[PDB]
Coordinates of C-alpha atoms and ligand atoms in Angstrom, one line a residue:
X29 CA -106.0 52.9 112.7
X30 CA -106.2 50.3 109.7
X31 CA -109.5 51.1 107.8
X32 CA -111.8 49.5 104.9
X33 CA -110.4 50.4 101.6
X34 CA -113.4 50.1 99.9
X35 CA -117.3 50.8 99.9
X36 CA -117.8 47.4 98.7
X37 CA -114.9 45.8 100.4
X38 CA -116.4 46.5 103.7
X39 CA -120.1 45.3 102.2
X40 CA -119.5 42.0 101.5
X41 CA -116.3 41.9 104.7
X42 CA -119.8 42.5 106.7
X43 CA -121.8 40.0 105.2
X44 CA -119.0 37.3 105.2
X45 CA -119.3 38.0 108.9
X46 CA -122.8 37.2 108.9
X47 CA -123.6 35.0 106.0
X48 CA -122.0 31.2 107.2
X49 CA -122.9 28.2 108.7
X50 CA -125.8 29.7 110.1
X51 CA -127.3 30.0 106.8
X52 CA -127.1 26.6 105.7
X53 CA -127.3 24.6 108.7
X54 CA -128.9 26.2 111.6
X55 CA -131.8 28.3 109.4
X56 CA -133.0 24.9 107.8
X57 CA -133.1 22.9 111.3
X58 CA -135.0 25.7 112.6
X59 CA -137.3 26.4 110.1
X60 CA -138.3 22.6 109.6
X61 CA -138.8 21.9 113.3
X62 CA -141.3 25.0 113.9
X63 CA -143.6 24.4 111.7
X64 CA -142.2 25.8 108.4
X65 CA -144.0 28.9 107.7
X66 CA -145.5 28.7 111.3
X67 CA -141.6 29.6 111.6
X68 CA -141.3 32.5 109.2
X69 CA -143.5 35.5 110.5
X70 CA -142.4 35.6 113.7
X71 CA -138.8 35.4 111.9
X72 CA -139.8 38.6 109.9
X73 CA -141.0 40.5 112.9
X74 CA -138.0 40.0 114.8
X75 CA -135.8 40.8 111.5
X76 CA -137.9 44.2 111.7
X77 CA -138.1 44.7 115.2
X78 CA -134.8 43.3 116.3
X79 CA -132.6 42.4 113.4
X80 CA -132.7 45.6 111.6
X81 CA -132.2 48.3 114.6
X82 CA -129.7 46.3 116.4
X83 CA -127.0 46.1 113.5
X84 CA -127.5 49.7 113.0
X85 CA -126.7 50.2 116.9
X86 CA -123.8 48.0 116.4
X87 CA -122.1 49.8 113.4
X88 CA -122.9 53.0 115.1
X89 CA -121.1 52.1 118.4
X90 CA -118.0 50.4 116.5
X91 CA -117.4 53.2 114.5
X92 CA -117.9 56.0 117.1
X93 CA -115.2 53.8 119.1
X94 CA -113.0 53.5 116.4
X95 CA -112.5 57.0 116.1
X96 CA -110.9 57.0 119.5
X97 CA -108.9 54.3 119.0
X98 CA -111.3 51.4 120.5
X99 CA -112.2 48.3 118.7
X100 CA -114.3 46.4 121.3
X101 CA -117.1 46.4 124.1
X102 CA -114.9 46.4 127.4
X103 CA -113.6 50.3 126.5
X104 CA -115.9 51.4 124.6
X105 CA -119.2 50.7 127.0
X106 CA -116.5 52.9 129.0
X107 CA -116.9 55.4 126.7
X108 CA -120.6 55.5 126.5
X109 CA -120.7 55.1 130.1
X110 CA -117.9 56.3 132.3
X111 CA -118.1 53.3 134.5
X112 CA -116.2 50.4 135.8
X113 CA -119.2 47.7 135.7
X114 CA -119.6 49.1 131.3
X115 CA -115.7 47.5 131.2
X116 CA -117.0 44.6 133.3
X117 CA -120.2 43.9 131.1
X118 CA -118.1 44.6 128.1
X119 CA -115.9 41.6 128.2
X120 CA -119.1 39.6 127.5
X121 CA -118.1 41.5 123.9
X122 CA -115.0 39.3 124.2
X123 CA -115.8 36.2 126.0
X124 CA -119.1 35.6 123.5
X125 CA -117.0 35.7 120.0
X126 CA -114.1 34.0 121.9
X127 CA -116.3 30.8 122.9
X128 CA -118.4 30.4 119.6
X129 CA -114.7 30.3 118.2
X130 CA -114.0 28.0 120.6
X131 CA -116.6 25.9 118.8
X132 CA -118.0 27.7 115.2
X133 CA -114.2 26.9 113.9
X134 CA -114.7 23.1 114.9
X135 CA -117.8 22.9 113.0
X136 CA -116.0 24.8 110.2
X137 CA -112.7 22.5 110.4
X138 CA -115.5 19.4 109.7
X139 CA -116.4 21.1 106.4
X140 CA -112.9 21.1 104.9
X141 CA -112.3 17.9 105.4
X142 CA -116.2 16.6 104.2
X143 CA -114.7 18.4 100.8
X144 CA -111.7 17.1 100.9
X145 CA -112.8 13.5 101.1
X146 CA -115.7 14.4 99.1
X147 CA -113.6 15.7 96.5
X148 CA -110.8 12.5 96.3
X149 CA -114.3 9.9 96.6
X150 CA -113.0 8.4 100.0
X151 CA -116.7 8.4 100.9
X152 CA -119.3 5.9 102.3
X153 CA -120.6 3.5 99.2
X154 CA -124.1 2.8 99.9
X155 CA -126.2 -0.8 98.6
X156 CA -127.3 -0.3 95.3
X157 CA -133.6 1.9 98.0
X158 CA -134.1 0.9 101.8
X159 CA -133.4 4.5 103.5
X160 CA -132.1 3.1 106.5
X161 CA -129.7 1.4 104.4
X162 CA -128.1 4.7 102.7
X163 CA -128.3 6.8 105.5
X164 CA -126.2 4.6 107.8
X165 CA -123.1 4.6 106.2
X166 CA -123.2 8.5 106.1
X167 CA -123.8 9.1 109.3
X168 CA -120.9 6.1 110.9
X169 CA -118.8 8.1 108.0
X170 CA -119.7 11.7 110.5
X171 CA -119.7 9.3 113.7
X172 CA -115.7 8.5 113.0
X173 CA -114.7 11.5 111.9
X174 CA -115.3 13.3 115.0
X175 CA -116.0 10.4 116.9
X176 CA -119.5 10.1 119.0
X177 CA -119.5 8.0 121.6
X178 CA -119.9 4.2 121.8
X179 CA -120.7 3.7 124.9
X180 CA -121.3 5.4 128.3
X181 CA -118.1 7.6 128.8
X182 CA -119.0 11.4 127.3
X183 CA -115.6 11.2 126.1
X184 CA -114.9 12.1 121.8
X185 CA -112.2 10.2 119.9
X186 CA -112.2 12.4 116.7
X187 CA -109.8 10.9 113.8
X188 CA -106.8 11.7 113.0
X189 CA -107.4 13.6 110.1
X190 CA -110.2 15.7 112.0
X191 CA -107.4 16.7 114.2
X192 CA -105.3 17.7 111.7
X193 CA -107.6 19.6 109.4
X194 CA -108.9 21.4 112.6
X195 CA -105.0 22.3 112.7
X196 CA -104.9 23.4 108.8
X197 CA -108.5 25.0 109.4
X198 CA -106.6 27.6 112.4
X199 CA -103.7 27.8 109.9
X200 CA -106.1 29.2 106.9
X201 CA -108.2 31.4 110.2
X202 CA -104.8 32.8 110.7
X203 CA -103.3 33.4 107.5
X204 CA -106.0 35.4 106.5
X205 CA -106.0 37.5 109.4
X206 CA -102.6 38.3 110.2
X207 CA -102.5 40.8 106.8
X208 CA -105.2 42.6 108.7
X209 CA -108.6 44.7 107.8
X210 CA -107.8 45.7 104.0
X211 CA -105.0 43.1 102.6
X212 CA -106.3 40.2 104.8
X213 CA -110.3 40.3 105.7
X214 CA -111.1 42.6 102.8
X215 CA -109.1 40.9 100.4
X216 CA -110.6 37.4 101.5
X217 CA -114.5 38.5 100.9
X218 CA -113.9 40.0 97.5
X219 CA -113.0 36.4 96.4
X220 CA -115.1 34.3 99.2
X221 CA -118.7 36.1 98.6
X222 CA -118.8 36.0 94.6
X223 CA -117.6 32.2 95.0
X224 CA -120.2 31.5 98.0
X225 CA -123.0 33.2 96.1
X226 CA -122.7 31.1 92.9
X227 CA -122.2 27.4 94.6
X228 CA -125.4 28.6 96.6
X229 CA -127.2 28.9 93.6
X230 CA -126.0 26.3 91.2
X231 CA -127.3 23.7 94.7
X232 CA -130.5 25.3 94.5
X233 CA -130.9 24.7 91.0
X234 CA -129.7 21.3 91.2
X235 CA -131.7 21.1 94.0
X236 CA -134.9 22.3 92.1
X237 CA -134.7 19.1 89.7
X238 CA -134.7 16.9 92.6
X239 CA -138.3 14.2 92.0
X240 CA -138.7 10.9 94.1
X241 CA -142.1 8.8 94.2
X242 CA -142.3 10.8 98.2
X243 CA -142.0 14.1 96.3
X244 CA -140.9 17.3 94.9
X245 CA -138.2 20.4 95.9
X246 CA -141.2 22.5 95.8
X247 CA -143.1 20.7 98.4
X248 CA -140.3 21.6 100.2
X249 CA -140.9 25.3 99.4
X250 CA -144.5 25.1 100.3
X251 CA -143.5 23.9 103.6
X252 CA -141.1 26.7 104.2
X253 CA -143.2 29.4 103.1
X254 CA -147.0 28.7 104.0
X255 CA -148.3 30.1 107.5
X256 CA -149.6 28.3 110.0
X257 CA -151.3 31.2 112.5
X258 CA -152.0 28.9 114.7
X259 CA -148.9 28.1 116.0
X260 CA -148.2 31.9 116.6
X261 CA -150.0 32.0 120.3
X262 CA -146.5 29.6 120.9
X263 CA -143.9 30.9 122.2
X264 CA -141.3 28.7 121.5
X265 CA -141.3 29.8 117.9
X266 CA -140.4 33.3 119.0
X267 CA -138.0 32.6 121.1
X268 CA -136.3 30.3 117.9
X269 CA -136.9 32.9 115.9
X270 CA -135.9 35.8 117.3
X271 CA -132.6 33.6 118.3
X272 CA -131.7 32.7 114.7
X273 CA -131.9 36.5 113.8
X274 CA -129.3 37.4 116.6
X275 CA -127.1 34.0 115.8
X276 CA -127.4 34.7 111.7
X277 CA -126.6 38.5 111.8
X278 CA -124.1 38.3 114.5
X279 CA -126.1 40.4 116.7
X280 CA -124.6 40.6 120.3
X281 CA -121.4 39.1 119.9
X282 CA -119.5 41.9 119.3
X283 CA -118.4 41.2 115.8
X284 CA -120.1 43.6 113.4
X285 CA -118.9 46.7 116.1
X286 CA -115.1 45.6 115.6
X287 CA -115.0 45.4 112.3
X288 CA -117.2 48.7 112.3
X289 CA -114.4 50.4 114.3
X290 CA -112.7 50.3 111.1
X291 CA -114.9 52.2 109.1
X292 CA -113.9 55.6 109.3
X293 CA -115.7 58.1 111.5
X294 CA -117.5 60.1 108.4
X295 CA -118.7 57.3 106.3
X296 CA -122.1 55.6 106.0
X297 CA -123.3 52.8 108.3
X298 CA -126.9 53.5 107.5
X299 CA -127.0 51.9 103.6
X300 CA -124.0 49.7 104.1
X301 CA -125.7 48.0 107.5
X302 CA -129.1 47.8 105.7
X303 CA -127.6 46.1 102.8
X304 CA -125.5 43.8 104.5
X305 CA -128.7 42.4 106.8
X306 CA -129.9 42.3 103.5
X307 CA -127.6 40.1 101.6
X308 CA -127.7 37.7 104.9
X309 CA -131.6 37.1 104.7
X310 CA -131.5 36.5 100.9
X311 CA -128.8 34.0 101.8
X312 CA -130.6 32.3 104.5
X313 CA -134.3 32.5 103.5
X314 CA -133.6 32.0 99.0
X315 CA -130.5 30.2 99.7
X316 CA -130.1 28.6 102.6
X317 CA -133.7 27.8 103.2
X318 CA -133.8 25.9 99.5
X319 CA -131.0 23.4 99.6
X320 CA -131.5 21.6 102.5
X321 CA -135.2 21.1 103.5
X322 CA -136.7 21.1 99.9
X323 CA -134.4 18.0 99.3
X324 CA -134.9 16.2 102.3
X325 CA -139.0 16.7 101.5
X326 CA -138.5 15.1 97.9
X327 CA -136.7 13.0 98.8
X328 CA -138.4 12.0 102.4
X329 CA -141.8 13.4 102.4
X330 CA -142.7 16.5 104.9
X331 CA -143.0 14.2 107.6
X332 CA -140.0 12.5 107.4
X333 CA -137.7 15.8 106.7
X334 CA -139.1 17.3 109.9
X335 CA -138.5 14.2 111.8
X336 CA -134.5 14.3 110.8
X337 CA -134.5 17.7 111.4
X338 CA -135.5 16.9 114.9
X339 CA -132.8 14.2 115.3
X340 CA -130.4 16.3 115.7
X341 CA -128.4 19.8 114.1
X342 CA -125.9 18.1 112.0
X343 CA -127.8 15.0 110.4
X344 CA -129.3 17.1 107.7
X345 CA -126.3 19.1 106.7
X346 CA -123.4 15.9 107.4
X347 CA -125.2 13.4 107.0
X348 CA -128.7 13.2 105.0
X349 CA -127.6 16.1 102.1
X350 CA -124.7 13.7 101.1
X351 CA -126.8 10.7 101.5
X352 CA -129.3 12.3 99.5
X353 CA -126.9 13.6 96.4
X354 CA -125.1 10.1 96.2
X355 CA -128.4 8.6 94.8
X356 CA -127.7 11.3 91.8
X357 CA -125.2 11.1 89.4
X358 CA -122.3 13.1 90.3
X359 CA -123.7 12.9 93.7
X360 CA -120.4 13.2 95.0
X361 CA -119.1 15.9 93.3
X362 CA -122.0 17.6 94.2
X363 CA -121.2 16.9 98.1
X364 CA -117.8 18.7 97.3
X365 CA -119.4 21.8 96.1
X366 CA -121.7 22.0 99.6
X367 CA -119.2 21.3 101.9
X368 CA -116.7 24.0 100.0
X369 CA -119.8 25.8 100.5
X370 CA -120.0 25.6 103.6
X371 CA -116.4 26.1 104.4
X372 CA -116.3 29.4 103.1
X373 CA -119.3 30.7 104.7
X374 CA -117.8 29.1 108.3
X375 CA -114.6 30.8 106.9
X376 CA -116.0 34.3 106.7
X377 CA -117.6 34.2 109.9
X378 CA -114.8 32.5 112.1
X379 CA -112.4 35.2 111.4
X380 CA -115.2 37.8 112.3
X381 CA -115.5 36.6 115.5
X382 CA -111.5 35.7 116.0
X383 CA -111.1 39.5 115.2
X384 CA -112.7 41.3 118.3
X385 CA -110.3 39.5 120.9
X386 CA -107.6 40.4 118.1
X387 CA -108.7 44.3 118.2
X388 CA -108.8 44.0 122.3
X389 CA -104.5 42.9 122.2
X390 CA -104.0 45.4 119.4
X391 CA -105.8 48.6 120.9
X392 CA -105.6 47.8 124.4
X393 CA -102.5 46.0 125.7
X394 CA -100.4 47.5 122.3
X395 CA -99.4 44.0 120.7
X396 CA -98.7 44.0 116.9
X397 CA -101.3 42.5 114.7
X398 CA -98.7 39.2 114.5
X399 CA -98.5 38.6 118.1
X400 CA -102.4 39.6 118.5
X401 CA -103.2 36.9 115.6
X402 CA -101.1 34.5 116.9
X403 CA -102.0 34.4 120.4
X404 CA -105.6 34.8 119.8
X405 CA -105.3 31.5 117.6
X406 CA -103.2 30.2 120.4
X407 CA -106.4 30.2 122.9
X408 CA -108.8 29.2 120.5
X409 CA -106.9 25.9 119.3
X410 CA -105.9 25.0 123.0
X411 CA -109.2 25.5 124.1
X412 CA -110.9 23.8 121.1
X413 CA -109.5 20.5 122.8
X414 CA -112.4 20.4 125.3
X415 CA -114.9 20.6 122.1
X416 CA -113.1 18.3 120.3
X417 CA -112.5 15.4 123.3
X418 CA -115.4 16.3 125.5
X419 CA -119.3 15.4 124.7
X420 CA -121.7 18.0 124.5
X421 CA -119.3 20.3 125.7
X422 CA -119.8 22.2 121.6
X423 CA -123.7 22.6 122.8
X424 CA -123.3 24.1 126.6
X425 CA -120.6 26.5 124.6
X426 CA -123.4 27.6 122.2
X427 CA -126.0 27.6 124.8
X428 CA -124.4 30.4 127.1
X429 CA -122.6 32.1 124.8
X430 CA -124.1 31.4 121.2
X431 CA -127.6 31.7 122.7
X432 CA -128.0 33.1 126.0
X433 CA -125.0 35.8 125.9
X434 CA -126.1 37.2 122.3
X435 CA -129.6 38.0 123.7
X436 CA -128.3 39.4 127.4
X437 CA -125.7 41.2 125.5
X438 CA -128.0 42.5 122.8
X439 CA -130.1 43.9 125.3
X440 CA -127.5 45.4 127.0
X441 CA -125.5 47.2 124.5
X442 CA -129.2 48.9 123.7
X443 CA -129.4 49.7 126.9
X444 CA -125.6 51.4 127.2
X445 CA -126.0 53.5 123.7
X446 CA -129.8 54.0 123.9
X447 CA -130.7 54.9 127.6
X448 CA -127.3 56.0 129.3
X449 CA -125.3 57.2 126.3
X450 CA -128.6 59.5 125.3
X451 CA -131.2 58.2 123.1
X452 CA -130.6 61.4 120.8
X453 CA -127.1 61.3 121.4
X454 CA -127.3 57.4 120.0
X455 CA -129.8 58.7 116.7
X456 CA -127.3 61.6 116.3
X457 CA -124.4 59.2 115.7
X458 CA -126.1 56.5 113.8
X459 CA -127.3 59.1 111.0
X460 CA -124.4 61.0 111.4
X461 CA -122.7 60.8 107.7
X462 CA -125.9 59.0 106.2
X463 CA -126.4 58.1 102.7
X464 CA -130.1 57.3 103.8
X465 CA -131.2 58.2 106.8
X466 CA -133.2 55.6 109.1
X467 CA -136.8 56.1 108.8
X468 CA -138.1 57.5 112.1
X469 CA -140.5 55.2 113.4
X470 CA -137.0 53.0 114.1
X471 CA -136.0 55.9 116.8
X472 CA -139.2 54.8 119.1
X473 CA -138.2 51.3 118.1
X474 CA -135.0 51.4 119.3
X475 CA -135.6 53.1 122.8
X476 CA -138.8 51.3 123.4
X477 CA -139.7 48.2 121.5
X478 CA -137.0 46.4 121.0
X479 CA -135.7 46.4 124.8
X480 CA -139.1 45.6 125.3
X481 CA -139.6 42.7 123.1
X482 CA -136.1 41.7 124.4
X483 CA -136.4 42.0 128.0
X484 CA -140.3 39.8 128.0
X485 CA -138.3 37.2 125.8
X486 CA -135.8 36.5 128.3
X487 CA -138.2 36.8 131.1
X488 CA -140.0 33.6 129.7
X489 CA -136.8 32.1 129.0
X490 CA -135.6 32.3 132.5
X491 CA -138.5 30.7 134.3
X492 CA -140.2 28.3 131.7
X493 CA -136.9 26.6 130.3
X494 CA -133.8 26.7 132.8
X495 CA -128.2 17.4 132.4
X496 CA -125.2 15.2 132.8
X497 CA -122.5 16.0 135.2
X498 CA -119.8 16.7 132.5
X499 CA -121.5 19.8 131.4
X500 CA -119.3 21.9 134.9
X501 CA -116.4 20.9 133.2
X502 CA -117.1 23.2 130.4
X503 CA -118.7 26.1 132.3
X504 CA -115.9 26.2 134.7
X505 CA -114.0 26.5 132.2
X506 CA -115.7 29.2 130.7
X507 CA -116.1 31.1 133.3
X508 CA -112.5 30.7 133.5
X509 CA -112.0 32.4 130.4
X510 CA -114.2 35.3 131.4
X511 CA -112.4 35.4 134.3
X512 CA -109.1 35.5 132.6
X513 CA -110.7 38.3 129.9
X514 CA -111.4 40.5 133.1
X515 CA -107.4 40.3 134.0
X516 CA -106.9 41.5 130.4
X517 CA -109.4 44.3 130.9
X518 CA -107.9 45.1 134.2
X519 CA -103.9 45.2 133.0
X520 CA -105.0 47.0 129.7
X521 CA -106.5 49.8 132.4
X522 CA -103.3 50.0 134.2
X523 CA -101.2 50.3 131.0
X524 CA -103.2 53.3 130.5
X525 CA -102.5 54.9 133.8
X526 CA -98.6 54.2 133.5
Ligands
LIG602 C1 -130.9 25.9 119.6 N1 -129.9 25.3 118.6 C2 -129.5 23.9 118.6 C3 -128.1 23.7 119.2 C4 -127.1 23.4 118.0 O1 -126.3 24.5 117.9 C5 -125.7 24.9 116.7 C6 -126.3 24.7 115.4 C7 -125.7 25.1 114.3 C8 -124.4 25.7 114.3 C9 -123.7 26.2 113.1 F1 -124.5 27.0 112.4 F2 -123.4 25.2 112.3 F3 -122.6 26.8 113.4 C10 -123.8 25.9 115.6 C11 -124.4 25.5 116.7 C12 -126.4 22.2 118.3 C13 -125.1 22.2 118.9 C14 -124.4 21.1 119.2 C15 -124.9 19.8 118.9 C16 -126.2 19.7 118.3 C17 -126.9 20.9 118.0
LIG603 C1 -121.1 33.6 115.1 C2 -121.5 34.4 113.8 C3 -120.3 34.9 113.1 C4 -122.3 33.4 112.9 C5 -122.8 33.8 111.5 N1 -123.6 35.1 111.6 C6 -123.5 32.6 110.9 O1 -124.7 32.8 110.6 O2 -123.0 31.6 110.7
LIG604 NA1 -126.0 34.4 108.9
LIG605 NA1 -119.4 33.9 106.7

């Protein structure tokens, strides 16, 4: 089995996996539309309660199945649980990266070509103060690219040169990937985190001088960081914050136990899983948290920044940054450097969660990592085109998968490694070769408040928040796909008995 050359290799691998477009675009919508700080406790809570004993669960099972061979859910729930509904619920560790790919590399693909265009100045010219008048032409600029609808059809007419950088955007996914773990993956975040990090904080800093008659950056910060306990009887904030922990660390979507399959069965997962959630949260609450909304409020006003933030997921990020940083000199330059940004962090992450459907083909139906790569890309391009050409088909693909599955599956996987496996079984191996050892209030954690905190959230969910007719179009075709990833399961278990 190919494994992590290095300590820090497989560091900053994992926190490329978790530290993307979550970061910088989904943190900062979140934050700003819960009340700021109102936001942030509950955030911390479920990082503590959630966040934290989850990924070490994750790394534990990954590596413990890469041992025996096993990169992902559908066999290794197996071998935890000697069962034919573990391989069932296990494709969920399949399907959930498989449709956020579906999606997340979309997203990603819209990045490249921001920079690109950002980069050569083919860019929306504003009047040279009338808001209305600056942000339009910014957000027709994101309207044509990937081409909202006009009318009534829910039908997408992205641009050409969308297509095609979606098409170079799977090329770079692949190229990277098809060298594998240590030349490939490994490789890739030794160059993409160091470059990351530093655009990150040259934005905040830029970001920092930013002064307008409605404000400062650091009005933006005392937004973002001051309490509101008021708003913590709510509910909704928990279950938005306990989402964005699962959706920033890559909880439940089977991505941090593939590529923890690789690490070899004596090393730590203890220090490096600790200090890989850690690296995230520094990048989303100090970075991510301090580009976006602490702009929008200088330049905006509180008010204002929370209303955009409201309007939608992509009109900060695509549409009111840029707008913002081409009423500075250099401005658009400075849209190059977040949209480079943000491709690398997308970049990081898409091939974390390409890689678990690659480990199923490799480990379980014997492909070689070419054919795996390729075919893998082959199912995420083709089934990219309902993203692309159908409307809000990208947000019922995030809902059941990128929002609903990550929780369910969360849960479950807890529940498979913490109550069948043997909760001192499941301690055993997540200590087991330990540079630190996890503090043992997380052991009581583990088997009894975090399934708990889980299984209430998803109660409420259920019955206090359960559209147009287009929407079937994309869960029958997801359920398609898991239906298609349960063949899989099935002939990989019949190679295994010939
Ligand atoms: C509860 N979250 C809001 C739904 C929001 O989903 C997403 C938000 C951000 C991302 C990103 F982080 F960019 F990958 C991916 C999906 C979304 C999806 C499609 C359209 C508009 C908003
Ligand atoms: C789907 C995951 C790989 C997403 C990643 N953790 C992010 O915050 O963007
Ligand atoms: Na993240
Ligand atoms: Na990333």
């Amino acid at each position: 089995r190919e494994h992590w050359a290095t300590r820090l290799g497989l560091i900053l691998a994992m926190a490329g996996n978790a530290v993307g477009l979550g970061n910088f675009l989904r943190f900062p919508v979140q934050a700003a539309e819960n009340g700021g700080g109102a936001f942030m406790i509950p955030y911390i809570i479920a990082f503590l309660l959630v966040g934290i004993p989850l990924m070490w669960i994750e790394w534990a099972m990954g590596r413990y199945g890469g041992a025996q061979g096993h990169g992902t859910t559908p066999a290794i729930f197996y071998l935890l649980w000697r069962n034919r509904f573990a391989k069932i619920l296990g494709v969920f560790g399949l399907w959930i990266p498989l449709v956020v790919a579906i999606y997340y590399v979309y997203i990603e693909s819209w990045t490249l070509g921001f920079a690109i265009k950002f980069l050569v100045g083919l860019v929306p010219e504003p009047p040279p103060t009338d808001p209305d008048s600056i942000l339009r032409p910014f957000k027709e600029f994101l309207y044509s690219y990937i081409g909202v609808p006009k009318g009534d059809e829910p039908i997408l007419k992205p641009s050409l040169f969308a297509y095609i950088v979606f098409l170079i955007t799977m090329f770079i996914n692949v190229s990277i990937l098809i060298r594998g773990i240590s030349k490939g993956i490994e490789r890739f975040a030794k160059i993409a985190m160091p470059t990351l990090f530093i655009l990150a904080v040259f934005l905040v800093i830029r970001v920092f001088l930013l002064e307008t008659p409605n404000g400062t950056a650091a009005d933006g910060l005392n937004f973002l960081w001051t309490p509101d306990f008021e708003k913590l009887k709510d509910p909704g904030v928990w279950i938005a914050a306990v989402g964005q922990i699962f959706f920033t660390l890559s909880l439940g979507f089977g991505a941090i136990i593939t590529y923890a399959s690789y690490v070899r069965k004596d090393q730590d997962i203890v220090l490096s899983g600790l200090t890989a959630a850690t690296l995230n949260e520094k990048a989303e609450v100090i970075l991510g948290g301090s580009i976006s909304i602490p702009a929008a409020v200088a330049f905006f006003g509180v008010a204002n920044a929370v209303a955009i933030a409201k309007a939608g997921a992509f009109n900060l990020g695509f549409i009111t940054l840029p707008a913002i940083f081409s009423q500075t000199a250099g401005g658009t330059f400075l849209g190059f450097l977040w949209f480079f940004l943000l491709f690398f962090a997308g970049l990081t992450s898409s091939i974390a969660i390409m890689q678990p459907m690659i480990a199923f083909l490799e480990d379980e139906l014997k492909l070689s990592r070419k054919h795996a790569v390729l075919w893998t890309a082959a199912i995420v391009f083709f089934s990219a085109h309902l993203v692309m050409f159908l409307n809000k088909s990208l947000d019922e693909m995030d809902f059941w998968a990128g929002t609903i599955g990550v929780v369910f599956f969360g849960l479950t996987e807890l529940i498979i490694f913490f109550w069948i496996f043997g909760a001192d079984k499941a301690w055993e191996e997540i200590n087991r070769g330990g540079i630190i050892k996890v503090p043992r209030i997380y052991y009581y954690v583990m088997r009894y408040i975090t399934p708990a905190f889980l299984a209430v959230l998803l109660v409420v969910w259920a019955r206090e928040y359960i559209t147009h007719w287009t929407v079937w179009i994309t869960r029958f075709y997801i359920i398609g796909l898991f239906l298609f990833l349960t063949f899989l399961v099935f002939l990989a278990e019949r190679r295994r008995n010939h």
